[PDB]
Amino acid sequence: GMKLAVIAANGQAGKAIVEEAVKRGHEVTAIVRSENKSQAESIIKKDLFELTKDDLTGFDAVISAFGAYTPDTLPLHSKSIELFNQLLAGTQTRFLVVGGAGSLYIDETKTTRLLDTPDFPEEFKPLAKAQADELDLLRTKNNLNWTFVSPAVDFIPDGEKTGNYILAGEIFTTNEKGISQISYADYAIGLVDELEKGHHIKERISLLEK
Amino acid sequence: GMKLAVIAANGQAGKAIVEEAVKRGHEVTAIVRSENKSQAESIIKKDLFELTKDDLTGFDAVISAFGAYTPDTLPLHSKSIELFNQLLAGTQTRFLVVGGAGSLYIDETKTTRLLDTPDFPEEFKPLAKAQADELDLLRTKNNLNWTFVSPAVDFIPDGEKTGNYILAGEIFTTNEKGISQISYADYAIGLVDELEKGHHIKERISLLEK
Amino acid sequence: GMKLAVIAANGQAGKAIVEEAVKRGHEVTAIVRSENKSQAESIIKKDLFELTKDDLTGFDAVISAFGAYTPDTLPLHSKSIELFNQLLAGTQTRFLVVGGAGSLYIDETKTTRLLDTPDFPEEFKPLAKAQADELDLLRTKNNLNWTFVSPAVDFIPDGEKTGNYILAGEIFTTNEKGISQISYADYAIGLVDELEKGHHIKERISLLEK
Amino acid sequence: GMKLAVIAANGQAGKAIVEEAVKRGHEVTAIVRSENKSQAESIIKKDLFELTKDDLTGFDAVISAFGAYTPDTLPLHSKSIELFNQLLAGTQTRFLVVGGAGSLYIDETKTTRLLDTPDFPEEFKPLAKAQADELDLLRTKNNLNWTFVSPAVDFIPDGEKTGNYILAGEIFTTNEKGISQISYADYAIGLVDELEKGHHIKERISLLEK
Ligand SMILES: [Cl-]
Ligand SMILES: [Cl-]
Ligand SMILES: [Cl-]
Ligand SMILES: [Cl-]
Ligand SMILES: [Cl-]
Ligand SMILES: [Cl-]
Ligand SMILES: [Cl-]
Ligand SMILES: [Cl-]
């Protein structure tokens, strides 16, 4: 039994994690901006960047499922990291981030990331860059127990809950079909598994179907 | 002349469509979130999902160049089909969608699509599958005069405007030199031609430069 | 300890299998056209299509690594099957074929094969088609204990012997990197494993690295 | 005028090269396996691997458009480099190779190549890697005046002959409209231009239509 806080729990990914974590038996606090649509026990209706340490004290882990509402608010991904670091560094609390797949390295050389390939679609670049900047900023946070959780390339909100996912690392990975996809449901399962049985501190993991 | 409404007329695709339609002497209304940058002289400042039945009445045809490019919003392609069907079913108003080439069939059996083949780039799959689910759902709407207009595999924004294009059906098609290519401007000529010379009602067509 | 015959043992794939099988301790007969370069025990210098039943009697399994020397002799792949069937059908002897990857199905629907995709390179089609026709002819051989062994897409003669391969089935498969490659050495290992520990009778298996 | 030898002059690439070179008034010798179908007026009926040092003497430049397209023969790209180096090292005879676009670097760091990216089609990898190993080995030959000439990603046989092309270096380059395209005829103009205006000795260059 853990006490978890989920930022932006009204988001599609956020409530996916809430619903999964609740099912596991953990007591979940939803930190939201509007009325709570999630299955969460307690609600803190507050603006993300107005959070204090006293808001995040008394949690085993804090999971940010923050997603920029507008393209000009995309830089808030980085500002959120800076904020959360200010609030959680020094403490032993875990800070998990629902990340992007664009920042995954293409191979073991770890010189180029998916984001940087000539064929990476223009319309994805703004979010992918913000999520990449987000991850780059986390690596400089020495006294923060962070874990960046990259989803698959194809991340599907109401995708089928298969129950069978693959845990990978810093490098882009596919299943046996050469495909990189995962549902929000299966992703939540993998993320909560890393909460219950979590090796990976101050590093990024990745999740995918099958 | 006809009376046309274009959703997302500020985008590159929609704007090329509006500009082509206007110089041919059509009455064009732009349905956009922000300031109208297209050559449409009539504006309706709403997004799709609050358009009423009255908003879309009195039009000869409605062209959706709508786009969404985040994991959360990618399913809005199909959800927009639900909306537009609700607002236009029963009426004889034509409904055209700017689609993708990924859903095109590789051969005459019409089973395997381009996005199904192992050489189809993984990074193109989020958008391709979203647009494919869009077409799949659109085929259901039997009380809607729909036309899905797939571009070429290389859909070039701001590409050279050649006067020539090839109209094909549901099968993936290349020109005499074997390439699948079309600029936005040429695609616009093809789409508007289809509006002026209506044939393919409740059908998917494809366009490519000759 | 098995008694194996390898057709075209002087070929790069052929001697790969011979050298591997010899190492395992089996007694290998090389059926070749010129001087024996393989490590094989006994040699039958004879033209393939002049083989008789008395040439192939007294073998636990016969492995054909036949490769067409000229593009106009590519149809000999099919003729070889017809010949081997005539020689081995009725007997309990296993007949393994070093096949191609082009005939692998793209997905579970099993309607389209890699060979048939729009992007499959023209220069590969003649061999791929002959190897596909080869496999199609085998399926009609009811009283033949055949096993078609497809290699990976990238099949490399002097590739590194990793020792770690994946056994797959009728459907195209990749490793965790989304890559389909294998060395001749690793392929030989997998093929001889199917000889020693062989489930798969009257069906096709596929092999690949990692 | 110059004295040129072209290996595999019967192939589509080599023939376009020979035809371009001849009409410019160069003395062209075709080194081919079979009857010379190119416009070369001098013929040497051998394949590469039996050419002697005397066979390749007295030429200003030697252009290899050699191709191999089976798993067994694909490594002959690199083996031909060994041969041609043996026959031409020490001499000041230029040696040009018709290469591939797959080995082109994606950015200025010159690490990741196109064939290294996860979107690079799996079916193109056998030939791309073979040609990449070819370039890698060719860089070793310091006593050889070599020039590797990469085409565009879309190398169109029998494509339209536009008078315009873009010469680039080792970095993957697209034109103003963002496409990477070149016909055989345009590539031939570029290659022959390089012969007439020698600059890039011991270098890899790339060509694409403007
Ligand atoms: Cl689904
Ligand atoms: Cl890793
Ligand atoms: Cl505005
Ligand atoms: Cl059709
Ligand atoms: Cl190797
Ligand atoms: Cl299977
Ligand atoms: Cl001849
Ligand atoms: Cl350069």
PDB file of C-alpha atoms in Angstrom, chain A residues 18-150:
ATOM      1  CA  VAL A  18      -5.205   6.580 -11.175  1.00  0.00           C
ATOM      2  CA  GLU A  19      -7.709   3.848 -12.033  1.00  0.00           C
ATOM      3  CA  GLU A  20      -4.923   1.267 -12.236  1.00  0.00           C
ATOM      4  CA  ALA A  21      -3.272   2.375  -8.986  1.00  0.00           C
ATOM      5  CA  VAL A  22      -6.619   2.449  -7.169  1.00  0.00           C
ATOM      6  CA  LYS A  23      -7.331  -1.090  -8.276  1.00  0.00           C
ATOM      7  CA  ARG A  24      -3.990  -2.201  -6.821  1.00  0.00           C
ATOM      8  CA  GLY A  25      -5.164  -0.838  -3.470  1.00  0.00           C
ATOM      9  CA  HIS A  26      -3.040   2.295  -3.112  1.00  0.00           C
ATOM     10  CA  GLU A  27      -4.481   5.530  -1.724  1.00  0.00           C
ATOM     11  CA  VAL A  28      -4.333   8.036  -4.565  1.00  0.00           C
ATOM     12  CA  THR A  29      -4.510  11.818  -4.346  1.00  0.00           C
ATOM     13  CA  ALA A  30      -5.557  13.570  -7.545  1.00  0.00           C
ATOM     14  CA  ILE A  31      -4.037  16.982  -8.175  1.00  0.00           C
ATOM     15  CA  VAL A  32      -6.267  18.608 -10.778  1.00  0.00           C
ATOM     16  CA  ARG A  33      -7.384  21.958 -12.191  1.00  0.00           C
ATOM     17  CA  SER A  34     -11.107  21.297 -12.662  1.00  0.00           C
ATOM     18  CA  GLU A  35     -13.735  18.864 -11.360  1.00  0.00           C
ATOM     19  CA  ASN A  36     -12.416  15.376 -10.647  1.00  0.00           C
ATOM     20  CA  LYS A  37     -13.419  12.825 -13.278  1.00  0.00           C
ATOM     21  CA  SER A  38     -10.950  10.214 -12.019  1.00  0.00           C
ATOM     22  CA  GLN A  39     -11.626   7.466  -9.468  1.00  0.00           C
ATOM     23  CA  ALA A  40      -9.244   9.104  -7.010  1.00  0.00           C
ATOM     24  CA  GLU A  41      -9.825   9.228  -3.265  1.00  0.00           C
ATOM     25  CA  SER A  42      -8.762  12.726  -2.362  1.00  0.00           C
ATOM     26  CA  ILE A  43      -8.604  15.762  -4.630  1.00  0.00           C
ATOM     27  CA  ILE A  44      -6.382  18.818  -4.547  1.00  0.00           C
ATOM     28  CA  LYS A  45      -7.868  21.334  -6.963  1.00  0.00           C
ATOM     29  CA  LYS A  46      -4.909  23.610  -7.528  1.00  0.00           C
ATOM     30  CA  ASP A  47      -2.817  25.016 -10.358  1.00  0.00           C
ATOM     31  CA  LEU A  48       0.248  22.840 -10.926  1.00  0.00           C
ATOM     32  CA  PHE A  49       2.781  25.671 -10.691  1.00  0.00           C
ATOM     33  CA  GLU A  50       1.229  26.906  -7.451  1.00  0.00           C
ATOM     34  CA  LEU A  51       2.008  23.668  -5.621  1.00  0.00           C
ATOM     35  CA  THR A  52       4.078  23.823  -2.440  1.00  0.00           C
ATOM     36  CA  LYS A  53       6.213  21.285  -0.582  1.00  0.00           C
ATOM     37  CA  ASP A  54       3.390  20.954   1.940  1.00  0.00           C
ATOM     38  CA  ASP A  55       1.200  19.801  -0.953  1.00  0.00           C
ATOM     39  CA  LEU A  56       3.605  17.014  -1.911  1.00  0.00           C
ATOM     40  CA  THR A  57       4.700  15.888   1.556  1.00  0.00           C
ATOM     41  CA  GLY A  58       3.330  12.555   2.746  1.00  0.00           C
ATOM     42  CA  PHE A  59       3.642  10.706  -0.558  1.00  0.00           C
ATOM     43  CA  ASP A  60       5.665   7.616  -1.442  1.00  0.00           C
ATOM     44  CA  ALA A  61       5.718   8.744  -5.065  1.00  0.00           C
ATOM     45  CA  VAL A  62       4.466  11.589  -7.247  1.00  0.00           C
ATOM     46  CA  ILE A  63       3.427  10.786 -10.826  1.00  0.00           C
ATOM     47  CA  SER A  64       3.179  13.672 -13.273  1.00  0.00           C
ATOM     48  CA  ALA A  65       0.928  13.035 -16.258  1.00  0.00           C
ATOM     49  CA  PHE A  66       1.049  16.719 -17.170  1.00  0.00           C
ATOM     50  CA  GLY A  67       0.187  17.524 -20.777  1.00  0.00           C
ATOM     51  CA  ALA A  68       0.385  20.965 -22.378  1.00  0.00           C
ATOM     52  CA  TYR A  69      -3.095  22.225 -23.269  1.00  0.00           C
ATOM     53  CA  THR A  70      -1.780  24.663 -25.891  1.00  0.00           C
ATOM     54  CA  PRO A  71       1.321  24.568 -28.173  1.00  0.00           C
ATOM     55  CA  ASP A  72       2.538  27.887 -26.738  1.00  0.00           C
ATOM     56  CA  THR A  73       2.341  26.350 -23.266  1.00  0.00           C
ATOM     57  CA  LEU A  74       4.572  23.450 -24.338  1.00  0.00           C
ATOM     58  CA  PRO A  75       7.568  25.020 -22.539  1.00  0.00           C
ATOM     59  CA  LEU A  76       5.686  24.359 -19.272  1.00  0.00           C
ATOM     60  CA  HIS A  77       6.974  20.779 -19.428  1.00  0.00           C
ATOM     61  CA  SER A  78      10.430  22.064 -18.526  1.00  0.00           C
ATOM     62  CA  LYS A  79       9.133  24.551 -15.966  1.00  0.00           C
ATOM     63  CA  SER A  80       7.196  21.736 -14.289  1.00  0.00           C
ATOM     64  CA  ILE A  81      10.411  19.748 -13.846  1.00  0.00           C
ATOM     65  CA  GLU A  82      12.179  22.752 -12.330  1.00  0.00           C
ATOM     66  CA  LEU A  83       9.210  23.203  -9.997  1.00  0.00           C
ATOM     67  CA  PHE A  84       8.943  19.563  -8.944  1.00  0.00           C
ATOM     68  CA  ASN A  85      12.680  19.412  -8.308  1.00  0.00           C
ATOM     69  CA  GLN A  86      12.358  22.404  -6.006  1.00  0.00           C
ATOM     70  CA  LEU A  87       9.599  20.598  -4.130  1.00  0.00           C
ATOM     71  CA  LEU A  88      10.901  17.033  -4.000  1.00  0.00           C
ATOM     72  CA  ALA A  89      14.720  17.173  -4.072  1.00  0.00           C
ATOM     73  CA  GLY A  90      16.289  16.291  -0.734  1.00  0.00           C
ATOM     74  CA  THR A  91      13.344  14.049   0.108  1.00  0.00           C
ATOM     75  CA  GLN A  92      13.279  10.328  -0.638  1.00  0.00           C
ATOM     76  CA  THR A  93       9.998  10.595  -2.574  1.00  0.00           C
ATOM     77  CA  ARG A  94       9.963   9.113  -6.086  1.00  0.00           C
ATOM     78  CA  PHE A  95       9.008  11.359  -8.996  1.00  0.00           C
ATOM     79  CA  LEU A  96       7.745   9.586 -12.118  1.00  0.00           C
ATOM     80  CA  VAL A  97       7.087  11.354 -15.409  1.00  0.00           C
ATOM     81  CA  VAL A  98       4.804  10.249 -18.223  1.00  0.00           C
ATOM     82  CA  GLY A  99       7.180  11.031 -21.057  1.00  0.00           C
ATOM     83  CA  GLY A 100       7.474  10.783 -24.820  1.00  0.00           C
ATOM     84  CA  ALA A 101       8.944   8.242 -27.227  1.00  0.00           C
ATOM     85  CA  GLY A 102      10.677  10.864 -29.369  1.00  0.00           C
ATOM     86  CA  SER A 103      13.652  11.077 -27.004  1.00  0.00           C
ATOM     87  CA  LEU A 104      14.505   7.379 -27.295  1.00  0.00           C
ATOM     88  CA  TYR A 105      17.954   6.631 -28.725  1.00  0.00           C
ATOM     89  CA  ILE A 106      18.061   4.837 -32.080  1.00  0.00           C
ATOM     90  CA  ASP A 107      20.883   2.463 -31.088  1.00  0.00           C
ATOM     91  CA  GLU A 108      23.613   1.537 -28.602  1.00  0.00           C
ATOM     92  CA  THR A 109      25.856   4.396 -29.746  1.00  0.00           C
ATOM     93  CA  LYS A 110      23.373   6.770 -28.079  1.00  0.00           C
ATOM     94  CA  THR A 111      24.313   9.711 -30.300  1.00  0.00           C
ATOM     95  CA  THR A 112      21.030  10.213 -32.155  1.00  0.00           C
ATOM     96  CA  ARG A 113      17.451  10.149 -30.921  1.00  0.00           C
ATOM     97  CA  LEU A 114      14.224   9.410 -32.790  1.00  0.00           C
ATOM     98  CA  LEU A 115      13.391  13.020 -32.611  1.00  0.00           C
ATOM     99  CA  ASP A 116      16.427  13.856 -34.693  1.00  0.00           C
ATOM    100  CA  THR A 117      15.843  11.579 -37.712  1.00  0.00           C
ATOM    101  CA  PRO A 118      15.144  13.148 -41.141  1.00  0.00           C
ATOM    102  CA  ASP A 119      11.737  11.444 -41.372  1.00  0.00           C
ATOM    103  CA  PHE A 120      10.402  12.455 -37.946  1.00  0.00           C
ATOM    104  CA  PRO A 121       7.106  14.265 -38.735  1.00  0.00           C
ATOM    105  CA  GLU A 122       7.138  18.053 -38.312  1.00  0.00           C
ATOM    106  CA  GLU A 123       3.822  18.178 -36.449  1.00  0.00           C
ATOM    107  CA  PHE A 124       5.199  15.913 -33.713  1.00  0.00           C
ATOM    108  CA  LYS A 125       8.381  17.920 -33.180  1.00  0.00           C
ATOM    109  CA  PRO A 126       6.986  20.621 -30.856  1.00  0.00           C
ATOM    110  CA  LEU A 127       5.699  18.140 -28.255  1.00  0.00           C
ATOM    111  CA  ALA A 128       8.622  15.750 -28.785  1.00  0.00           C
ATOM    112  CA  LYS A 129      11.138  18.550 -28.299  1.00  0.00           C
ATOM    113  CA  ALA A 130       9.457  19.790 -25.124  1.00  0.00           C
ATOM    114  CA  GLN A 131       9.414  16.239 -23.766  1.00  0.00           C
ATOM    115  CA  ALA A 132      13.052  15.788 -24.771  1.00  0.00           C
ATOM    116  CA  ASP A 133      14.078  19.061 -23.108  1.00  0.00           C
ATOM    117  CA  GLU A 134      12.080  17.806 -20.140  1.00  0.00           C
ATOM    118  CA  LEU A 135      14.155  14.626 -19.905  1.00  0.00           C
ATOM    119  CA  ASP A 136      17.447  16.466 -20.481  1.00  0.00           C
ATOM    120  CA  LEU A 137      16.696  18.766 -17.545  1.00  0.00           C
ATOM    121  CA  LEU A 138      15.972  15.814 -15.249  1.00  0.00           C
ATOM    122  CA  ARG A 139      19.414  14.268 -15.775  1.00  0.00           C
ATOM    123  CA  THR A 140      20.973  17.351 -14.175  1.00  0.00           C
ATOM    124  CA  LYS A 141      18.854  16.854 -11.051  1.00  0.00           C
ATOM    125  CA  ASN A 142      21.324  14.926  -8.896  1.00  0.00           C
ATOM    126  CA  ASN A 143      19.356  14.906  -5.637  1.00  0.00           C
ATOM    127  CA  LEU A 144      16.054  13.907  -7.233  1.00  0.00           C
ATOM    128  CA  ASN A 145      14.751  10.336  -7.353  1.00  0.00           C
ATOM    129  CA  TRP A 146      13.270  10.689 -10.835  1.00  0.00           C
ATOM    130  CA  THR A 147      12.126   8.135 -13.395  1.00  0.00           C
ATOM    131  CA  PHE A 148      11.199   9.109 -16.954  1.00  0.00           C
ATOM    132  CA  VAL A 149       8.707   6.637 -18.411  1.00  0.00           C
ATOM    133  CA  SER A 150       8.699   6.744 -22.211  1.00  0.00           C
TER     134      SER A 150
END
